[PDB]
Design a protein around this nucleic acid. Structure first.
Ligand code: NA
Ligand code: NA
Ligand code: NA
Ligand code: NA
Length: 199
RNA sequence: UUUUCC
């Protein structure tokens, strides 16, 4: 419908280079069904519009509720990349309709890493590591609540630093002990709570 | 080496 369109669309950032609108649609339609989020027969995603030069897509869904549920996919890995799923900036919650997803997608780690006591900074990462591989490095210590690898906005190349938050606050110091000061060729990892060196 | 339209 006309009034609900703003509540039926999502921004998806950090998309794989060269991805087609059809490949993106198939990915989300399958994940929605496999995750138990699809609320009827047929495809929940109606269309995808990609901006190739700017590296983002907008999904359009058939229903308000399926759009909300799909927010739970924020951080899902697609061709090595953490998809950044967000509301359009002009989105306004409707009356009687929920704002936040009610389901959890197993193994999907949010990209939203708020400043907090145990948010970690990881600097000095080799730039050839993609989001998936950096996430795996950190997951070795324990499950993550949130993670983002910082990329150049124009080229898509990793800038070699990331932020994360472990589910268990006590894993923070274990990751620091295991990674801080690790030498990788010309780089030396700096792993510390992000508050220590933030601007 | 402190997360990017209609
Ligand atoms: Na990117
Ligand atoms: Na389930
Ligand atoms: Na970009
Ligand atoms: Na930039």
């Amino acid at each position: 419908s006309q009034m609900t369109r703003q509540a039926r669309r999502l921004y998806v950032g950090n998309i794989p280079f060269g991805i087609t609108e059809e490949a993106m649609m198939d990915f989300f339609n399958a994940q929605m069904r496999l995750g138990g989020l699809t609320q009827a027969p047929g495809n929940p995603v109606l269309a995808v519009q990609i901006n190739q030069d700017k590296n983002f897509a907008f999904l359009e869904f058939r229903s308000v509720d399926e759009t909300t549920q799909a927010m739970a996919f924020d951080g899902i890995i697609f061709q090595g990349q953490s998809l950044k799923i967000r509301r359009p900036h002009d989105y306004q919650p409707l009356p009687g309709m929920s704002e936040n997803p009610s389901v959890y997608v197993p193994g999907v780690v949010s990209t939203v890493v708020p400043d907090s006591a145990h948010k970690l900074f990881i600097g000095g990462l080799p730039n050839y590591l993609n989001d998936d591989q950096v996430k795996e490095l950190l997951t070795s210590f324990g499950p993550l609540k949130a993670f983002n690898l910082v990329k150049d906005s124009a080229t898509g190349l990793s800038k070699g630093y990331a932020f994360c938050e472990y589910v268990d606050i006590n894993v923070t110091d274990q990751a620091i002990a295991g990674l801080n000061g690790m030498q990788l060729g010309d780089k030396k990892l700096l792993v510390q709570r992000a508050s220590v060196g933030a601007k």
